[PDB]
Amino acid sequence: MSRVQLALRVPDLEASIGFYSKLFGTGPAKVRPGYANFAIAEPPLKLVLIEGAGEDATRLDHLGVEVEDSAQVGHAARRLKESGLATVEENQDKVWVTGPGGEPWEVYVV
Template sequence: MKRFHVHVVVPKLDESVRFYSSMFGANPTVLKDDYAKWMLEDPRVNFAISARGGEAGVNHLGFQVDSEEELTALREQVVAGSVEIQDQPGAQCCYAASDKYWTQDPAGVPWETYHTLGDIPLFGADSHEKTVAGASSACCAPAVSIPAVVQRKVGCG
């Protein structure tokens, strides 16, 4: 089963943890000095915040899946739609090891689809994540632009 994922960069983690804990009526499932995550069932969402620099606001959106089979099926669905992707097998980011891929919507919003393999002790154990064209990236979002959807003319019937 898929779970919607949202990651927001916040200027002050403690204030945001208080706000979102009140908003969701639940304490974070994971709480670190620079990161918090709520694994909510209603609505079914993985909502994460971090205070590790970067511009405040939505960092990326995505889907967390429960199996490699679901990850493969969603990847094939995206590729079949002529959308460019960036694979990151065995990524170590946000206190978790995951197999994932990234894409980007036409407005430039990064989308992450991933299957979590287990917990790790650091926010980003990968010192040099694999990215498009071999560039290094910050944890949790590609630092380089992924080509957006291949432009196609779609007519109205």
């Protein structure tokens, strides 16, 4: 029904492509220069690797929940809005919210 996105800013992108390839025993679903991503069935996960200006070690760029269709995005938007969370809308079709310590979540569609 839905799935976690984990987006890492890494210092060596090739290295990492290799690594997570072995860690999950699968290959990247898309590779572009300066970014690659993985659709992992088990564990269910969308791993985005973004490559970053050689600044020391990997940082967590952002987090997210990947859902199945546009309705669910809308629905969550309503739900987080009513629970009281600062929502920001990015235009079809995603919604951002932010943890107290600043970590950003994006609820979106594939």
